[PDB]
Structure 1
């Protein structure tokens, strides 16, 4: 409805003047003309916004005099006549502070952010004095009540008004300082009192700090035993004479059990998990009939039963975590026991062979400590792990002991620094540096076994334990319990006995490899570096520089066939699921760039062995899109390159199979971080007939 009729707009231009009102617009060519019609309350609040914009430009004398509506009896629109008196420009002047002893005048003037000659804006002064909209803002009330001056009152008054300039005075009443004297918690019906008290940043004897109160509220909410909307401090026994404030945290319990569904699709298949976890277990009341109602409740110990799965492996795991070991220092203790069954699988060409399978039994114990003051934000994690590998018809890759077993005893030490500020879901700055080293005991230096000459011993050269003297390729029936050697003739193969001439026989590569890898000996190094930077106003660039290394103390023993790096696909797999490290590149199918045996004459060609050395570099640009609360949808682009190799003997870290793509992330309060990604792989999968390049791949990810 054409309803402008602005009589008197000498300074405020018509365009932004109209734009000032949000709801009651006019007739135009927009989306059904912005639904322009008459709404009483919307019209009045729009008019108030007109006056507000006029004052924001710096006119307090602004007013509306004649607002009117005429309805067109012939053409059916409403014309609105608006009459505005503008007034005179106004300047801030001589903002003096009276009643300050703890802060000097210069500091308060710096904090207020108002200088001489700036146009009047009353909302600006009120916001800089007391920040109603945000509780964490940098206002003068917050600076006074963040050092323990709770009983402070600051009011703005006007003393002089001359030559269209204001004279402002701030009356500051300080009062006695504030000290915490009695802090207690009330409302814990199933969580013990010592769990809550040791994670509170408000402590008796300190001075009052509202910023400490907000932080401890957030910490209590993020603990996981209380609903974030129930924590409500209540200042009690506030005494303005002796300076004591007694705070009472009112808490309401929420729940312990929780089901997780981390994993993802993406052409390979479900690589996901399923976990039933109680976050409030108590291992000291496991034999208490009364307390055992949904399994014992109490301290903050977390016990989780997880089933991780895929089309080729099934892993059942039990985990127990104590976030405070010994009761004195925050040393998280994590223990885990898991059993996994996996089958042979060629990631480059989907194929599950169910007659070649092997099992893993793992027991792990670890302590993670927040090491104190070599700068904060550092975590040191140590762990001891024992793993048993039981093979079953596993003649694949570099394995030759298809029916044997392997043992793994490892100690892993890692340092992690995390600044990553400020929003936990969309960083603007910070860095995440993780360095980890896993070592097994150096068996080679101690035991008196020479692995270089292990193949020239009578105990490992085709003994022929078979007791039947049936026949041989050389026309001689093999004498039972005699050394043999394969000697092909014409087109068919065969074996011929040699008697007591083991010096010329065939080495049993299976037995030699079994002795080599009966107790795994190796060292592994991992390196991850995120370097969140800031460009423009919405662009966020993330770098993900990575490294990896696996080696053997005795080069004669060889790099261990287990615990190897596998590049390709998304990174939803872990080391808990299998003995694999599942490097992440989003332009190729899962784990498909792992090097293969490029020996055509070998009976196994496309089988994947693993990579010992890998480097990955990823640059990603992000736009917040709809960064809000209860929903954090945003978009991200990729440019990644990864290079892997099974032997660090002729490595060229200049191949770097490239991947480019873009996608989106969506986050929900309970659904978890969901995501859809698309990517094009510029390079060929290893061991493919035509070069070509892998096409677009869906990358649905969960975690419911």
Structure 2
């Protein structure tokens, strides 16, 4: 037994927001069917409801009540009665579950502070930063909000769940140099963990065809006082008469404030040397070559989960110069091992990814997502004849296979053998790679994560930069699956059917399989 006609609506208690705007946000008008959720769902459950409009703005000391009057005939008159309290200031932040990571590392990335006013956007951003940091599980995080109406303040509990990231190679992710050079109170036989700094070592010890050594270190908060970071690395490798390559680099990153606070700028300086005699897979055959390179990279990253992102984007724009010795600064097979004592180039890249959910998300968080890729690259030259023999692009297949060599950049193009579009004598000086993907996860957990996908790729590469043509591409299609392991990176299976030919031959097209490892 109930009435059915909305005759009037009314407000009492409001000061912070205009009454007509709440009429709009309540989405009601006189002369409409009387219901209850129609009011309630729009006042206490949905993300644009009035109650949330107060709650998310730091006014947590509130209540609300739909008053019904004039219950006559077909009709009810309605009045919104609400309470406006005082805007809540944060009193304390409690954080728990950090087995292997000092609070110093995490409290510096929080966006809320004790002593400032509460707001939903700051809290959500802080949880995004913690999720992207990766030292904790990106799932099953939720803050334990506890208000206090006597003092009118709120304290936030952050219960976190820990996971350890480590894998011949080693990926120590939370390794501290201060705890190495001066243990705090007891190293107790354990590695010097903490501070969120990371160390990594890798190499091949086959020694009868391949051999390599490498090391890298990254400090995300240099000096422990500002978000600017230091990165250093070095490498060395033999391959069978032999070919010798070694080098090192140093870089420096910085968060910006101009477009937004998601942009990060990075600058890096690098050195490399190549050492050869009677070698044959490169155009160079006998000598020693050097290169000094300065790189500027502008990037923006706004995704939620590193392992299976569901919203946001990842944009990067990069340029990499080496000084122009061909000009007046340096001025003055036939003679090709000549003039490349020092190599010359300027390399440009653009790289963008874009993840959208297709079925709401938040609810049934397993979800389903549509991804999207778009990579372009150019290896320009100051002088028409002194084109660089090193740093060229190599495209086709898994991409991982190219890291048997370190003087080229390997680019996966799925559905085409391996290194197929760029054979000997046709090294790539420009490339383009595009492609959709539709993905569904089977399982998302602390230890292991699984998902399946269908793609639609398209890519190409050119030996001559002046013939770059992003609308003439070697198309593809297929399906695949990937696995994330508790103590190893990705492993996955991709099948693809190459549709177009290559250089007039259909030999490399058709059905192909790719076996991805590590991470793309």
TM-score tier (shorter):
0.7 to 0.9
Rounded to whole Å, the distance in 1 between the matches of 2:313 and 2:98 is 37
| CA displacement at 1:382 relative to structure 2 | 1.0
Aligned equivalent of 2:407, options 552, 564, 579: 579
1:67-86 matched pairs, under 5 angstroms: none
| CA displacement at 1:563 relative to structure 2 | 0.6
Q: State the superposition RMSD in angstroms.
A: 4.0
Task: Quickly say closer, same or farther: Cα 1:639–1:255, change in 2 above 3 A.
Answer: closer
| CA displacement at 1:575 relative to structure 2 | 7.3
Rounded to whole Å, the distance in 2 between the matches of 1:685 and 1:665 is 27
Rounded to whole Å, the distance in 1 between the matches of 2:94 and 2:455 is 49
Rounded to whole Å, the distance in 2 between the matches of 1:675 and 1:116 is 59
Q: Name the residue aligned to 1:701.
A: 516
Is 2:146 the counterpart of 1:235? Answer: yes
Rounded to whole Å, the distance in 2 between the matches of 1:657 and 1:356 is 39
- 1:484-513, CA deviations, whole angstroms, 9 ceiling, x for partnerless residues? xxxxxxxxxxxxxxxxxxxxxxxx84xx44
Contact 2:204 2:212 in 1 (8 A): yes
| CA displacement at 1:383 relative to structure 2 | 0.8
Task: Quickly say closer, same or farther: Cα 1:584–1:560, change in 2 above 3 A.
Answer: same
| CA displacement at 1:154 relative to structure 2 | 1.5
Contact 1:550 1:559 in 2 (8 A): no
Q: Name the residue aligned to 2:271.
A: 386
Rounded to whole Å, the distance in 2 between the matches of 1:279 and 1:331 is 18
| CA displacement at 1:572 relative to structure 2 | 4.3
Q: Name the residue aligned to 1:172.
A: 82
1:210-221 matched pairs, under 5 angstroms: 210-221=120-131
Gaps of 5+ in 2: 361-366
| CA displacement at 1:639 relative to structure 2 | 4.5
Q: Name the residue aligned to 2:316.
A: 434
Aligned equivalent of 2:133, options 220, 223, 226: 223
Rounded to whole Å, the distance in 2 between the matches of 1:652 and 1:526 is 14
Aligned equivalent of 1:620, options 418, 423, 436: 436
1:1-400 matched pairs, under 5 angstroms: 61=1, 90-131=4-45, 137-183=47-93, 185=95, 191-226=101-136, 229=140, 232-233=143-144, 235=146, 238-240=148-150, 243-245=152-154, 247=155, 249=157, 254-259=162-167, 275-288=169-182, 290-291=186-187, 293-307=189-203, 315-342=212-239, 355=240, 357-391=242-276, 393-400=278-285
| CA displacement at 1:384 relative to structure 2 | 1.0
Rounded to whole Å, the distance in 2 between the matches of 1:591 and 1:223 is 34
- 1:560-609, CA deviations, whole angstroms, 9 ceiling, x for partnerless residues? 21110112123446779622222332120121110434xxxxxxxxxxx5
Task: Quickly say closer, same or farther: Cα 1:381–1:554, change in 2 above 3 A.
Answer: same
Gaps of 5+ in 1: 1-60, 62-87, 260-273, 343-354, 451-507, 598-608
Task: Quickly say closer, same or farther: Cα 1:148–1:115, change in 2 above 3 A.
Answer: same
Task: Quickly say closer, same or farther: Cα 1:580–1:166, change in 2 above 3 A.
Answer: farther
Is 2:379 the counterpart of 1:550? Answer: yes
- The DSSP-based 3-state class of the residue aligned with 2:397 is coil
Aligned residues: 505
| CA displacement at 1:668 relative to structure 2 | 6.1
Contact 1:643 1:653 in 2 (8 A): no
Q: Which has the larger radius of gyration?
A: 1
Rounded to whole Å, the distance in 1 between the matches of 2:330 and 2:202 is 43
Rounded to whole Å, the distance in 1 between the matches of 2:368 and 2:160 is 40
Task: Quickly say closer, same or farther: Cα 1:375–1:569, change in 2 above 3 A.
Answer: same
